[PDB]
């Protein structure tokens, strides 16, 4: 139903909120210093760097996912709204009706003027003896 | 680096053709 879609959008919004915080927390959690107990520390620093690299790219792809999921609802909102939907439908009605009445007045004047010319021609023919 | 939405009677009487002319080997 509609409420299922609303809950799905809410769940993915909360997942988007959770992912960003989960990305920022693990970057600084792994930056803490611990004493070595038979470690051979030569391999740990490159591991920490190579794990930091993917965690920052996780933030980058989280921003990209935000950009895409905002556009996902952009087309959802654009199809069912009411800012001027009941308003812009009638604003084209009277605008074209004004032109309709202007053309009606123009054709009325042309008809009257023409008919005058026709009667003038008629009485010009009647002016001749015929 | 589709259908004409008349195939159902087309195929039905074509089915009548398959029980009269079956495929023959």
């Amino acid at each position: 139903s509609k409420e299922t879609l609303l809950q799905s959008y809410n769940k993915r919004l909360k997942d988007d909120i959770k992912s960003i915080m989960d990305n920022f927390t693990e970057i600084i959690k792994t930056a803490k210093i611990e004493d070595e107990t038979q470690v051979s520390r030569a391999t740990q620093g490159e591991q920490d760097n190579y794990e930091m690299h993917v965690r920052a790219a996780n933030i980058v792809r989280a921003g990209e996912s935000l950009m895409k999921l905002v556009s996902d609802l952009k087309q959802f909102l654009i199809l069912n709204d009411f800012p001027s939907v009941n308003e812009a439908i009638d604003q084209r009605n009277q605008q074209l009706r004004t032109l309709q009445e202007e053309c009606d007045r123009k054709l009325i004047t042309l008809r009257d003027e023409i008919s005058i010319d026709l009667y003038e021609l008629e009485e010009e023919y009647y002016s001749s003896s015929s | 680096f589709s259908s004409i939405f008349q195939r159902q009677r087309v195929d039905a009487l074509l089915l009548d053709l398959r029980q009269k002319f079956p495929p023959k080997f």
Binding site: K2, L96, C103 | -
Partner: protein, 112 residues
């Protein structure tokens, strides 16, 4: 009807400023001497709370557009009434060609 696209542009074009906020945080962080630690801390706090008001903007955008979800009929035929001048206009053009033929019939009696 451009208000919500302006809100979406506010959501989008803020993110460049967010990138610059993160950059100004990290460059001041990697500096050995930081006289303006307050500027660094307010950059970090602004980046923290500003993604939050972007979320608030998204929530306001969807809540303003939530409960208007239905179908919409484009009622009336405004183009049908609009085209009602055009056949009168071509009738006027028919009268124009009729009077042009009247003039052409008036032409040949002038020479002879």
């Amino acid at each position: 009807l451009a208000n919500e696209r302006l809100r979406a542009l506010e959501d989008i074009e803020r993110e460049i400023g967010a990138i610059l906020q993160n950059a100004g945080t990290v460059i001041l962080e990697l500096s050995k001497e930081k006289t303006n630690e307050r500027l660094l801390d307010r950059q970090a706090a602004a980046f923290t709370a500003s993604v939050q008001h972007v979320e608030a903007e998204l929530s306001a955008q969807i809540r303003y557009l939530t409960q208007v979800a239905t179908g919409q009929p484009h009622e009336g035929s405004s183009y049908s009434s609009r085209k009602d001048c055009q056949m009168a206009l071509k009738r006027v053009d028919y009268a124009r060609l009729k009077l042009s033929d009247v003039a052409r019939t008036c032409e040949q009696m002038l020479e002879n």
